[PDB]
Design a protein around this ligand. Structure first.
Ligand SMILES: *[C@@H]1O[C@H](CO)[C@@H](O[C@@H]2O[C@H](CO)[C@@H](O[C@@H]3O[C@H](CO[C@H]4O[C@H](CO)[C@@H](O)[C@H](O[C@H]5O[C@H](CO)[C@@H](O)[C@H](O)[C@@H]5O)[C@@H]4O)[C@@H](O)[C@H](O[C@H]4O[C@H](CO)[C@@H](O)[C@H](O)[C@@H]4O[C@H]4O[C@H](CO)[C@@H](O)[C@H](O)[C@@H]4O[C@H]4O[C@H](CO)[C@@H](O)[C@H](O)[C@@H]4O)[C@@H]3O)[C@H](O)[C@H]2NC(C)=O)[C@H](O)[C@H]1NC(C)=O
Ligand SMILES: *[C@@H]1O[C@H](CO)[C@@H](O[C@@H]2O[C@H](CO)[C@@H](O[C@@H]3O[C@H](CO[C@H]4O[C@H](CO)[C@@H](O)[C@H](O[C@H]5O[C@H](CO)[C@@H](O)[C@H](O)[C@@H]5O)[C@@H]4O)[C@@H](O)[C@H](O[C@H]4O[C@H](CO)[C@@H](O)[C@H](O)[C@@H]4O[C@H]4O[C@H](CO)[C@@H](O)[C@H](O)[C@@H]4O[C@H]4O[C@H](CO)[C@@H](O)[C@H](O)[C@@H]4O)[C@@H]3O)[C@H](O)[C@H]2NC(C)=O)[C@H](O)[C@H]1NC(C)=O
Ligand SMILES: *[C@@H]1O[C@H](CO)[C@@H](O[C@@H]2O[C@H](CO)[C@@H](O[C@@H]3O[C@H](CO[C@H]4O[C@H](CO)[C@@H](O)[C@H](O[C@H]5O[C@H](CO)[C@@H](O)[C@H](O)[C@@H]5O)[C@@H]4O)[C@@H](O)[C@H](O[C@H]4O[C@H](CO)[C@@H](O)[C@H](O)[C@@H]4O[C@H]4O[C@H](CO)[C@@H](O)[C@H](O)[C@@H]4O[C@H]4O[C@H](CO)[C@@H](O)[C@H](O)[C@@H]4O)[C@@H]3O)[C@H](O)[C@H]2NC(C)=O)[C@H](O)[C@H]1NC(C)=O
Ligand SMILES: *[C@@H]1O[C@H](CO)[C@@H](O[C@@H]2O[C@H](CO)[C@@H](O[C@@H]3O[C@H](CO[C@H]4O[C@H](CO)[C@@H](O)[C@H](O[C@H]5O[C@H](CO)[C@@H](O)[C@H](O)[C@@H]5O)[C@@H]4O)[C@@H](O)[C@H](O[C@H]4O[C@H](CO)[C@@H](O)[C@H](O)[C@@H]4O[C@H]4O[C@H](CO)[C@@H](O)[C@H](O)[C@@H]4O[C@H]4O[C@H](CO)[C@@H](O)[C@H](O)[C@@H]4O)[C@@H]3O)[C@H](O)[C@H]2NC(C)=O)[C@H](O)[C@H]1NC(C)=O
Ligand SMILES: *[C@@H]1O[C@H](CO)[C@@H](O[C@@H]2O[C@H](CO)[C@@H](O)[C@H](O)[C@H]2NC(C)=O)[C@H](O)[C@H]1NC(C)=O
Ligand SMILES: CC(=O)N[C@@H]1[C@@H](O)[C@@H](F)[C@](F)(C(=O)O)O[C@H]1[C@H](O)[C@H](O)CO
Ligand SMILES: CC(=O)N[C@@H]1[C@@H](O)[C@@H](F)[C@](F)(C(=O)O)O[C@H]1[C@H](O)[C@H](O)CO
Ligand SMILES: CC(=O)N[C@@H]1[C@@H](O)[C@@H](F)[C@](F)(C(=O)O)O[C@H]1[C@H](O)[C@H](O)CO
Ligand SMILES: CC(=O)N[C@@H]1[C@@H](O)[C@@H](F)[C@](F)(C(=O)O)O[C@H]1[C@H](O)[C@H](O)CO
Ligand SMILES: [Ca+2]
Ligand SMILES: [Ca+2]
Ligand SMILES: [Ca+2]
Ligand SMILES: [Ca+2]
Lengths: 388, 388, 388, 388
């Protein structure tokens, strides 16, 4: 009924508790589970749901062959109930396309899907489950967006798009939507040199996005957005605890205003919570592949170029596959503070498990606790041999 | 709560954006997807849904053998959520029969199914999901209707029926319903010589239907209906851009008040938006079979017998199957104008793909954008070899 | 919100239009459809649904072997949306048992299931989806009830039960429920000599039930109930158009107050609408087995022992299986009169189709039209060979 | 809208009537039914549902191999509609973990799942389907809880947890929750020597729990809780009718304040209704394995150490498998008293049926009748040979 406002700060993060897990690849071995990738989580005022890009086939279906490809006419943003698997019978299609974001502004949901050939893509912006605005490609090279939820404040929902090269300068724009209409857009500013796949959260009337510099950086770019002024800035996480993948080994000193070098032309969607001493970074455990997942408390990671971990939690062991990770919060929970949450995509099949013809994923998701909770690890759990 | 009134004009159509796609044949290769044909789309005030005639069997079921036949006791109008596939578990049966139409008047939904042997068919008119009126065959030769949504204005929902020959003069009637009760009916008037399968839209208190002349015309007949006076007229699209299928090659000058000759006794359901310079026509790309699909901006197509395209958009490549197409709009969207939409049925299996015993379809649907958006093509996406 | 009152008479019945058909055995050949029998239809104020006794297994499941048996611990009254099939995923369990009835009183639904061994059965009466009353067997020989909907008037819902022999005198009782509580019960009165499986309808504050005399009668017993006085009487349909099965050939004169002889110890659930000249009887076409189904207009069938048909309609051809049939009406439809409806169970598998190990059914249902509509036939449609 | 208060006493229990049965293993032989164990039943004000711990795989899925294990990352508390099976498509995930409880306080539902390795487990307390409180392991040895519903009074919902050895003294705590927040907790008091898996019910402002002494007792410990004072006590059922499993033969005199010896280090979740002369105890019929299930009326079982049965009812024959059993009541039923209900888990597969690689269960549930109803037996009904 009223637009949500980001009026709280982050709760104190002392560990992470289990929130949701769908076991999709395990279940889908013998039931009608859609092939997906690029999942995330997003809340409405009365319900939190899982989101992902469907590949328009089941896992056991013969059409799962070739689902390593990212962009086809058979993809769609779907959502489904928390910790269920994305099945043919319980998945709701939000919009058609192969890159997406979605967020609820307190009154209703905006969802954005991009589709088209590489040189001629377009975003359709849906609001209250109707298409309202369309944006054509501006650089004719894979118009793409967050692949995790956007955040709204007083009806204003900023969204980061990038169009242009994955391996060289690109054109990044921040659109400021309200009711699916464009209030304003800006070209990227500040010192981030390449932006993809922003993972975002809102607190005290500011939106923080941790992104992927695909071109040069193994540290992550950060965009900080003021949704009232509709202005933003960008920099990198200063910390030497480097959080992209693949990446070089951690140094002793990071970079604040440039890419930390050592790996070019590659990366993974990731996230952080940047809140002074209450700062936690996610990363794959492996420097070489999307294997393992950990949370590291790195006080002042954003601003301190020598900051190292003071605490940590294993999410996925290094002998298990991970993938994309991103941020969401239940903005509508009761209580004095916003509880940080994240999900990790657990990718299975190709390219690393190539005895199957498909690529898919399941989801694990955690939220922060002010307790110091015991840790477990949360693998996908499927036996690929079963699919042979 | 109030009856809807057609109080807006059409938005400016500068391209088409993707709206819905169900990927049904791909998904149904390995999940419980009903065999269908004759699909369409229709909105309620709070939801838009996919509609089709079920064949009362799944695609992988052995009973899909023989589903090339149009009329059986196993067919029913079903609806299901936008861009989901029509599954056994998520499909709602509207009514029983093998020819249908459906539309929401602002307060509730009217659905019409016709069933029976060829010589003794009957329409049952359902309103608020209860049968209210029944109409017996008047020419004892396949009583049949639109196979796409009707349109209502102030409670009045006109519906075009035809009973009689597919290959010679037939008896076409326009019924004017309100709350499922017949207010009036008229025999066809004006210069259209044969009418089937009207695709209709409403704007500024008038309903425009683009139909199929199965007997003689490769140009399409048009019925224009005044739902307040409850009167109508008919003519043909004047344009030489001919839009039935199969059809002769395009001439330089069309016919306004007679069938454009060259193909007899055949056709496909299609549609147009006829709005002065804002006029767009759909057609299969092939003149010979239901292959490919394009949208052509043909200013004044209705009234100008020399009008040629000034713009276009590919929907389905000519190396992919199409099928029926039709019109719908979300009459309940907020905004100053009605956004034109359409769907294309993508038919698979028999008669052209005859290594399978079944015939089915998936759906793609688009709405108009006031942007000039990049184009993609939208095939069914299924590999028939997988079903062998 | 208010209790429904039977304030209307029957509409004029001039033919029957198709209402619902689930095609369950066809669909269930390759999807998760529950094995059922003893189906019926019943309306709530906002929805009409299909009802049946599940056998607690799918048709393709190995546990369908043996489902020819009527009474097991694996049976339950289920309901599901009109013209859908009873699937594992869309069926709601009303109550547990192997004999049932159900009806909505205008405020909420009463459902009754009987379970137990033959000598120790009990009815549980559910109201607003909670168990409220229980009734123990009184004759220790298969306590059993209607297998089709009950009818309510001002909160009073009479229900006919029989306990005792199927082939000799039994103890039949009429319970008068309100909010699931017993207001009163009576032993059977009038001249009916054996009662099973009453099919009931309500009009002008009276409830009429057409039942099965299993012991001696090939004419059907009738119970007429006054739900305000909570009293009833019974007789037989006088007409020589005999409507049980199996049955002797039709004579020229029937019996009003005794069983019409010729077949002993056998029968089928059936129904009629007894309304002076507006009287229609259902019967299987075959005198020998549950094959075919027709509706016959037999003016004054109840009271005229020489009355013969003046009109008719084929529902199921004599080369197709039928089964149980029963009455229901949408008491909540708008309009000046109650539209008569019925369903026919289309039984497949054992005992007549014994190359399969299972017995199941699909449903067809019709309502009356004041038009003279063309007729079709409505078989189950499944090919048993597909299940071999 | 208001918190529920335990203002009624128990109805008179004169027998048990059938309430719910899901036939899950039968149905799941050929449909997408999740593998489960540790089921229970719990009501909301408008709906009663089945609950269990999923194993994150279907029964026919290859991942069912190994589901004899109790604790994995693939488990979750799920709920589903009464007497449906827990399917992939109709199951709602309450929370992630391998030990649980859940109860509705009149305004909304609290659910609690525990997850983690054996030495580092944690409880997450969800309220209104959001995580609110987390509790870390205190004895670093499988933190575990009830595995059946909790009970609330005026917003206060006590919950029994145990952390520590299964075969020696452990640390049991009673947490008093309100809106998912901890109001208070107490260490176990009174004379019970070991507590696991409390089955609880509420009447006249007191909560009674019948638990499992795994270490020494074949009589059951009882905890009685005052949810207004937030205090409790504990003792054993005095009766010589011993109700754990496995167990020695029944003696003539029981123990009130110590474990009845004869079996060490083993047991089964069970329940009783302790209400003076209106006292009923459940037990497996076999003393040696989880086979058979009966209800025994044992007047004053709680307080009389020589009390023997005066009445009984067979629930499951001794030639059929049983398992866990527990208590629930519909606190929101209308009427002068609370109707006692219980469920029995019918375990199938390993360890006793070891030709299959999986372990799963179905559910049967009964409520009390003030009639003396005939008895049936209620086995799972599945043929294990079908799964070979
Ligand atoms: C029950 O549950 C408990 C809660 O989960 C669990 O306890 C938790 O245990 C985990 C696992 O050990 C702890 O996580 C670690 O935390 C480390 C930080 O803590 C240390 O440093 C602080 C500052 O100097 C100290 O304050 C702190 O001391 C305090 O706490 C102690 C408890 O553990 C207590 O005993 C003390 O008294 C004191 O009060 C403590 O000494 C953190 O450093 C560590 O992360 C690094 O190590 C991991 C390898 O294990 C890496 O995977 C990770 O990436 C980090 O190392 C990498 O990066 C560093 C920073 O850049 C580099 O310096 C390293 O060299 C290393 O770099 C290599 O690896 C990278 C990754 O592959 C690569 O990219 C690089 O290039 C390079 O190759 C870890 O997070 C956790 O904090 C505990 N939580 C709590 C509340 O105690 C308990 O164990 C469970 N109990 C049981 C019985 O099972
Ligand atoms: C990114 O996305 C962009 C947006 O989609 C995309 O640009 C789009 O490109 C398509 C594909 O080319 C364009 O569609 C065509 O539009 C044609 C009309 O435009 C021409 O004519 C106008 C009037 O004379 C001119 O105003 C116009 O010029 C303007 O626009 C230009 C941009 O393209 C620009 O460069 C200029 O500066 C200027 O400002 C332009 O010249 C339209 O004619 C065409 O349709 C015909 O051709 C198709 C074959 O491609 C047929 O399939 C179709 O049916 C039409 O031809 C048939 O029918 C005609 C009419 O009857 C006959 O005359 C023909 O002979 C032919 O008949 C045969 O075929 C029939 C079908 O099988 C058969 O039935 C007959 O019997 C016979 O056999 C097409 O629609 C589109 O408008 C562009 N949109 C926009 C906004 O620009 C861009 O390419 C993408 N970019 C990248 C990098 O990939
Ligand atoms: C398009 O749709 C139309 C609507 O459905 C359809 O027309 C319908 O056609 C059907 C099929 O013929 C009609 O049903 C029959 O109706 C018979 C009654 O009507 C006759 O008798 C009346 C009174 O004497 C006359 O008023 C009436 O005349 C009027 O109507 C005529 C239209 O048909 C018109 O032409 C006239 O001008 C006039 O105005 C008419 O003559 C009815 O008797 C019949 O049922 C019996 O026959 C069936 C066999 O076909 C049996 O299956 C059925 O059980 C009945 O016979 C059995 O029982 C009788 C009574 O006991 C016995 O006397 C018989 O001997 C027989 O008994 C044997 O069989 C039993 C069953 O197996 C067995 O149990 C016994 O032991 C014994 O073995 C049938 O219902 C229908 O009324 C028409 N409806 C309308 C509105 O016209 C039209 O055909 C379709 N059009 C096309 C082009 O396809
Ligand atoms: C239709 O439905 C009817 C309703 O269900 C059904 O009638 C019911 O029948 C059952 C099955 O018989 C009855 O259950 C039993 O009830 C016994 C108690 O009743 C007796 O004792 C009372 C007190 O002394 C008497 O008041 C009572 O008399 C009254 O009622 C009679 C009706 O039956 C009537 O005829 C009389 O006139 C009178 O008015 C009656 O005599 C109860 O004792 C019994 O349970 C024990 O026996 C079972 C074996 O069948 C065990 O499985 C069970 O565990 C109990 O025995 C074990 O434990 C005892 C206590 O500790 C020990 O003393 C025993 O030795 C034994 O111990 C061994 O076994 C244990 C379990 O394995 C093991 O752990 C031990 O270590 C040891 O090895 C049973 O519950 C029921 O009450 C009837 N209900 C009603 C309302 O009548 C009727 O039969 C059905 N009709 C048809 C036609 O099918
Ligand atoms: C059916 O008839 C009964 C009996 O007349 C109606 O019941 C009355 O309803 C009114 C207003 O809702 C009450 O205030 C009276 O107390 C009712 N009872 C009696 C015994 O008079 C009932 O409303 C009618 N049902 C419908 C749908 O109109
Ligand atoms: C799931 C898995 O098996 N992940 C492993 C790690 O356990 C570790 F062994 C590692 F060496 C590493 O990168 O850290 O290799 C990866 C992985 O095999 C490769 O990077 C790519 O093939
Ligand atoms: C899907 C497909 O393959 N469509 C093709 C067109 O690609 C083209 F090649 C064409 F020649 C034509 O009609 O335009 O043939 C049709 C088709 O094969 C036939 O008309 C009928 O068999
Ligand atoms: C479905 C079917 O085939 N029904 C037929 C009728 O078509 C007819 F041929 C008849 F003779 C008859 O009873 O009327 O036989 C029955 C049936 O075969 C038997 O009664 C029992 O086996
Ligand atoms: C289901 C079943 O077959 N249960 C039987 C009882 O019928 C009975 F025979 C009994 F001896 C007994 O314990 O009471 O054995 C058990 C069981 O086989 C074992 O205890 C463990 O293997
Ligand atoms: Ca990078
Ligand atoms: Ca034509
Ligand atoms: Ca009989
Ligand atoms: Ca024990």
């Amino acid at each position: 009924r009223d637009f949500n406002n980001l009026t709280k700060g982050l709760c104190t993060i002392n560990s992470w508790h289990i929130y949701g897990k769908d076991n999709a690849v395990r279940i889908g071995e013998d039931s009608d589970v859609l092939v997906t990738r690029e999942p995330y989580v997003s809340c409405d005022p009365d319900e939190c749901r899982f989101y992902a890009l469907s590949q328009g086939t089941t896992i056991r279906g013969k059409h799962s062959n070739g689902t390593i490809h990212d962009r086809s006419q058979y993809r769609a943003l779907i959502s489904w109930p928390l910790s269920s698997p994305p099945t043919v019978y319980n998945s709701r299609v939000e919009c058609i396309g192969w890159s997406s974001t979605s967020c609820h502004d307190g009154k209703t949901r905006m969802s954005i899907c991009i589709s088209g050939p590489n040189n001629n893509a377009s975003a359709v912006i849906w609001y209250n489950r109707r298409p309202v605005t369309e944006i054509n490609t501006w650089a004719r090279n894979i118009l793409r967006t967050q692949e995790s939820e956007c955040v709204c404040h007083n009806g204003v929902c900023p969204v980061v798009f990038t169009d242009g090269s994955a391996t060289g300068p690109a054109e990044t724009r921040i659109y400021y939507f309200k009711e699916g209409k464009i209030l304003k857009w800006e070209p990227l500013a500040g010192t981030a040199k390449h932006i993809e796949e922003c993972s975002c959260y809102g607190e005290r009337a500011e939106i923080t996005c941790t992104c992927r510099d695909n071109w040069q950086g193994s540290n992550r770019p950060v965009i900080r957005i003021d949704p009232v002024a509709m202005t933003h800035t960008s920099q990198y996480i200063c910390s030497p605890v480097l959080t992209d993948n693949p990446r070089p080994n951690d140094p002793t000193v990071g970079k604040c205003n440039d890419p930390y070098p050592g790996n070019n032309n590659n990366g993974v969607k990731g996230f952080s919570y940047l809140d002074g001493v209450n700062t936690w970074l996610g990363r794959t455990i492996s420097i070489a592949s999307r294997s393992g997942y950990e949370m590291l408390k790195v006080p002042n990671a954003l601003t301190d170029d020598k900051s190292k971990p003071t605490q940590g939690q294993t999410i996925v062991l290094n002998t298990d596959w991970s993938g994309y990770s991103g941020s969401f919060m239940d903005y509508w929970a009761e209580g004095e503070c916003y509880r940080a949450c994240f999900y990790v995509e657990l990718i299975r099949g190709r390219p690393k498990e190539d005895k199957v013809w498909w690529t898919s994923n399941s989801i694990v998701s955690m939220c922060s606790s002010t307790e110091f909770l015991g840790q477990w690890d949360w693998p996908d759990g499927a036996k690929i041999e079963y699919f042979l």
